[PDB]
Amino acid sequence: MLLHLIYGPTCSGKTDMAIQIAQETGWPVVALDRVQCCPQIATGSGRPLESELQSTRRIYLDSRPLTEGILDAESAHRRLIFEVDWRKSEEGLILEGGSISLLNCMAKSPFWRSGFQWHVKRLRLGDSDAFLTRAKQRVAEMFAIREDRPSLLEELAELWNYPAARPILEDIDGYRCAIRFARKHDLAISQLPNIDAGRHVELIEAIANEYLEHALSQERDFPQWPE
Numbered sequence: 001m002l003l004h005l006i007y008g009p010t011c012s013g014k015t016d017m018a019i020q021i022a023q024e025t026g027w028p029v030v031a032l033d034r035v036q037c038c039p040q041i042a043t044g045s046g047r048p049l050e051s052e053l054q055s056t057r058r059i060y061l062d063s064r065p066l067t068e069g070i071l072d073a074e075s076a077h078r079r080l081i082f083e084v085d086w087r088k089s090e091e092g093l094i095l096e097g098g099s100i101s102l103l104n105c106m107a108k109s110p111f112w113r114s115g116f117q118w119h120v121k122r123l124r125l126g127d128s129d130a131f132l133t134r135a136k137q138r139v140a141e142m143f144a145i146r147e148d149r150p151s152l153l154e155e156l157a158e159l160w161n162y163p164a165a166r167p168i169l170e171d172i173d174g175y176r177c178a179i180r181f182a183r184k185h186d187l188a189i190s191q192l193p194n195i196d197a198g199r200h201v202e203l204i205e206a207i208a209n210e211y212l213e214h215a216l217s218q219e220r221d222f223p224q225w226p227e
């Protein structure tokens with residue numbers, strides 16, 4: 001089997017790159033992401049829109065309530081090995097994502113050491129300013145009110161109802177920022193999606209800066225995959 005590994009920092013265009021290869025080849029893409037396995041934060045966690053898949057398939061390693069905690073990395077790694085192992089008859093698969101703890105498991109795992117052909121692509125963080133520009137547009141996309149999917153702020157207000165979701169979302173990019181932003185301005189979290197004209201802009205810029213923080217960590221902690 002051919003495994004087309006696309007990894008790299010947040011807001012690097014990885015997902016679209018993967019969808020395009022998947023349109024051409026017909027192969028599924030397995031999301032190398034733990035946080036995307038909670039569909040209740042589909043939007044904030046980066047899941048492509050159903051419209052954006054262009055009819056390609058995108059495979060998550062689990063589907064789990066947020067309050068069950070984010071999928072741990074060794075469990076996600078067991079799962080990934082299984083989604084690849086039972087498709088072993090197929091020409092190729094696309095593995096795309098930015099999970100730091102999960103890429104590190106793949107790099108320690110003997111499973112990948114043997115038995116596959118590979119095309120490996122590592123996307124890198126650009127200049128920070130260009131990064132923040134892409135980040136801010138991404139966040140505004142995740143903030144847009146559509147008919148077909150809850151916004152980030154809507155996902156957050158829904159879950160804030162459940163006290164056990166609170167600690168968990170405080171450890172997730174975007175959400176952590178949005179929560180801190182609410183307390184900073186004395187806003188109920190319920191209120192974030194009604195927020196004045198130019199406070200929308202502060203919050204977007206604040207999240208983008210949390211995304212770049214994360215992308216810096218990804219660049220530090222990522223494995224160096226051989227290619």
Ligand SMILES: Nc1ncnc2c1ncn2[C@@H]1O[C@H](COP(=O)(O)O)[C@@H](O)[C@H]1O
Pocket residue numbers: 033034035036044045046098099100101102171172173174
């Ligand atoms: N898709 C995602 N969306 C939001 N935050 C994420 C995402 N993936 C990782 N994180 C953050 O980075 C830490 C996850 O570690 P990892 O999966 O090992 O990169 C999480 O604890 C979140 O704080």
Ligand SMILES: CC(C)=CCSP(=O)(O)OP(=O)(O)O
Pocket residue numbers: 008009010011012013014015016044045046047097098173174211
């Ligand atoms: C880490 C966050 C906020 C979203 C996950 S999707 P990504 O950000 O890994 O994706 P792209 O490189 O934009 O496809």
